[PDB]
Write a protein that binds this ligand. Structure first.
Ligand SMILES: Nc1nc2c(ncn2[C@@H]2O[C@H](COP(=O)(O)OP(=O)(O)O)[C@@H](O)[C@H]2O)c(=O)[nH]1
Ligand SMILES: [Mg+2]
Lengths: 458, 136, 210
């Protein structure tokens, strides 16, 4: 009768939760195999409520997994010592309950992943991978079956050690790609498959090394990025960002013909969840290229760099990135918090990263926008111009930045008194950064301290 | 939704005093009675339009939650923080801050001197008025 | 059911976070002592917005692995959650992806807020430019510090805006209710006078700290 105490686990009362936890601990300590068998029997039966099945699945998962690696290893070793017949029964119950859950987050998939992490390195559950592949590839499988199996496969790939499943990585990737393909009618299946691919990217290094398999993966991801569903697009863009982060050196053949247009369209899109990822792609590209530049600077002493394959994609895309970021900076509202993570802040951060990366080359592509919109009657464009001018201050040589006392200062001083609060605050931020820049750009400190004090109070 | 028209219930009353300050709550229930924070905000004294009841009501800042809410009685007279010049300590027997009456000991520090003195004079005036009202 | 109460979950990490951020909102204080959370202590928080009253059943989850109890059991039927990490220890930031994964594996696209505590302590160990996780997963980030009450109300405001469905939602002043007037025995009045003088003698030590 574990159903009652498992149902009690959702109640907010302290006494009920404490009693439920005590009963669970007592049952687990008294007889672990029988307790697991009863939990799996509760999980398998579809007549129970959602809460009971979810709680039983979570308890089973917690019986095998822990954040501390030592505790997780201890749990897996304890699991391997259970009676073979009881293990067979519980594994059969957990495997059969796949596809009978009407809720999107399947609790049985976590149990499957835990048992897989426990047994696959010892090769104790050989039927698991063929059964999952058959479930995914069977045309007669229901939507819930496909979603549960894909989530289980993704969890298994993300959790287990990469070396233990290299033989069946090909079949796993084939199943995931067949889930992600356009022909699939269910959007939920697409989302689950894309999330599984995202979780399994680190596991497929050997597959990515093969040219044909890497090309197929890139093609299917680029196909998925154009899916009508917004969540699928967001997941695919996250996949692209992860691929760029992990396999930068392999993106030469794909950048430009396919990735450039997709990223530009994502940046120009009006959906925030898409524009954020579009900007984040180039932000991560700039960060990786900055790391490679640091590596090259270090290896200048060592003669040859180990993996400096920096193609300067950011520099080539600068003239297209800058106008889009400046246009994005305009989209703002008065009642919006300045710390709200809208595309405006992402665009500003991307502009700062581009300034720090391309250095002296940023100014020609940004300065005309500042000159045009520094006095635009619309407060939004004026805010965008002052924000961009403040962003571009870091990274270019101060001797090149000398055209700031000529025209910038007398206008930003006025902007510090602008009726709009937003432009006032952003001009204050800009002049604060100018306060840090000016000790470098000043020929002498004869006016450093007085002007600094005047600008602090400005 | 059920927003209707939000009323702060400050109407039908005159706001005699209002200034910014920080308030502290005495942890009498704790084994160590030392002071604890309560919030920062404008401390307001509200006098009823015709009932002649003067009450203290202070909310917090950026959250606008009640942290002290009780009436003013003629018994709240003597105890000051005369050792310092930026503090005031008083006792209340029925605090409805958490929608439940409790006894409380409270402290307050406005900025340094002038706000504290003005608050003390206004508090003494209100207390004298309530004493005159109750004497009849 | 005139309330719109939501089951909020605070995951955080070992120490450095919850049960002080919550206690700041609940009663108003700064717990300077580290009492490790033992269980899933629940505190109902109430806020007032222009759209009406809003309630949060805050399920405070212990950060220590040995005190977790029902580790993921509390992440059930959750509708919003907050991940908290200390900006003075990079280890607590390293574990944020694990907490996000655990939250996602049991809840479907629930709103999540990433908060960095202890920003007022100075000597910040996790620079603002080094925090990139919120960009990766489209998570809302904030800088909070319960000691100085710096942006301590922002996460709840953002969560309320997301859950209710009104970007223009703002915190409003809580209505005031007239307290009831009661009197008691004069012996308790003398006891309270003794407590009053005890309080007035001990007020100065708090001033020196402040
Ligand atoms: N929130 C917060 N806590 C601080 C700060 N400086 C020091 N602390 C201490 O850090 C401790 C955090 O522990 P806590 O979060 O309650 O443990 P947990 O409930 O297991 O997560 C508190 O006891 C505070 O005393 C600060 O600036 N902000
Ligand atoms: Mg805790």
């Amino acid at each position: 009768e574990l159903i009652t105490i498992l149902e009690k686990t959702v109640s907010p009362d302290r006494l009920e939760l404490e009693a439920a936890q005590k009963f669970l601990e007592r049952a687990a300590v008294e007889n672990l195999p029988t307790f697991l068998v009863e939990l799996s029997r509760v999980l398998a039966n579809p007549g129970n409520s959602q809460v009971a099945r979810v709680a039983a699945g979570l308890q089973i998962k917690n019986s095998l997994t822990s954040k501390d690696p030592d505790i997780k290893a201890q749990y897996q070793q304890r699991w391997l010592a259970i009676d073979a017949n009881a293990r067979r029964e519980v594994k059969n119950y957990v495997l059969q309950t796949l596809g009978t859950e009407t809720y999107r987050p399947s609790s049985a998939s976590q149990c499957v992943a835990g048992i897989a992490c426990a047994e696959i390195p010892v090769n104790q559950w050989p039927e698991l991978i063929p059964q999952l592949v058959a479930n995914v590839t069977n045309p007669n499988s229901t939507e819930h079956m496909k979603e549960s199996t894909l989530e289980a496969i993704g969890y298994i790939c993300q959790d287990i050690d990469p070396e233990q499943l290299q033989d069946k990585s090909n079949e796993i990737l084939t199943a995931i790609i067949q889930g992600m393909r356009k022909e699939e009618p269910s959007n939920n299946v697409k989302l689950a498959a894309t999330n599984a691919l995202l979780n399994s990217l680190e596991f497929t290094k050997a597959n990515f090394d093969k040219e044909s398999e890497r090309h197929f993966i890139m093609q299917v991801v680029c196909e998925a990025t154009q899916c009508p569903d917004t969540r699928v697009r967001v997941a695919a863009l996250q996949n692209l960002v992860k691929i760029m982060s992990l396999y930068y050196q392999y993106m030469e053949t794909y950048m430009g013909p396919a990735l450039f247009a997709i990223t530009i369209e994502a940046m120009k899109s009006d959906i925030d969840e898409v524009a954020l990822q579009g900007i984040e792609f180039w932000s991560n590209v700039c960060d990786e290229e900055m790391d490679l530049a640091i590596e090259a600077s270090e290896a200048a002493e060592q003669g040859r760099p180990p993996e400096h394959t920096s193609k300067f994609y950011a520099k080539g895309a600068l003239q297209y990135l800058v106008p889009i970021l400046t246009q994005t900076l305009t989209k703002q509202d008065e009642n919006d918090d300045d710390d709200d993570w809208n595309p405006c802040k992402a665009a500003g951060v991307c502009l700062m990263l581009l300034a720090t990366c391309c250095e002296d080359d940023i100014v020609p592509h940004v300065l005309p926008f500042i000159k045009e919109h520094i006095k635009n009657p619309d407060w939004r464009y004026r805010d965008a111009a002052v924000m961009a001018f403040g962003c571009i201050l870091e990274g270019p040589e101060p001797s090149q930045l000398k055209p700031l006392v000529i025209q910038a200062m007398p206008t930003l001083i006025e902007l510090m008194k602008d009726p709009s609060v937003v432009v006032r605050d952003t001009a204050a931020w800009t002049v604060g950064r100018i306060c840090e820049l000016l000790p470098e750009a000043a020929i002498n400190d004869v006016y450093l301290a007085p002007l600094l004090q005047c600008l602090i109070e400005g | 939704p059920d927003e209707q028209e939000i009323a702060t219930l400050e109407e039908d009353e005159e706001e005699l005093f209002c200034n910014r300050a920080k308030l502290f709550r005495f942890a009498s229930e704790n084994d160590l009675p030392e002071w604890k924070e309560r919030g920062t905000g404008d401390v307001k004294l509200l006098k009823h339009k015709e009932k002649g009841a003067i009450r203290l009501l202070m909310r917090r800042d950026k959250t606008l939650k009640i942290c002290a809410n009780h009436y003013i009685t003629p018994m709240m007279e003597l105890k000051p923080n005369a050792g310092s010049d930026r503090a005031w300590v008083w006792n209340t027997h029925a605090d409805f801050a958490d929608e439940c009456p409790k006894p409380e000991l409270l402290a307050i520090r406005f900025l340094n001197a002038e706000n504290a003195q003005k608050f003390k004079t206004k508090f003494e005036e209100c207390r004298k008025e309530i004493e005159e009202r109750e004497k009849k | 059911a005139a309330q719109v109460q939501f089951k909020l979950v605070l995951v955080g990490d070992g120490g450095t976070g919850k049960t002080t951020f919550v206690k700041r909102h609940l009663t108003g204080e700064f717990e300077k002592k580290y009492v490790a959370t033992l269980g899933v202590e629940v505190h109902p928080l109430v806020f007032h917005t222009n759209r009406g009253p809003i309630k949060f059943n805050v399920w405070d989850t212990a950060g220590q692995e040995k005190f977790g109890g029902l580790r993921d059991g509390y992440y059930i039927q959750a509708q919003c959650a907050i991940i908290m990490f200390d900006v003075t220890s990079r280890v607590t930031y390293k574990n944020v992806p694990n907490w996000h994964r655990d939250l996602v594996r049991v809840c479907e696209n629930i709103p999540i807020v990433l908060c960095g505590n202890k920003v007022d302590i100075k000597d910040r160990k996790v620079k603002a430019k080094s925090i990139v996780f919120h960009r990766k997963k489209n998570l809302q980030y904030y800088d909070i510090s319960a000691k100085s009450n710096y942006n301590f109300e922002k996460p709840f405001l953002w969560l309320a805006r997301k859950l209710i469905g009104d970007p223009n939602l703002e915190f409003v002043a809580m209505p005031a209710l007239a307290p009831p007037e009661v009197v008691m025995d004069p012996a308790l009045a003398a006891q309270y006078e003794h407590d009053l003088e005890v309080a007035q003698t001990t007020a100065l030590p708090d001033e020196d700290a402040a």
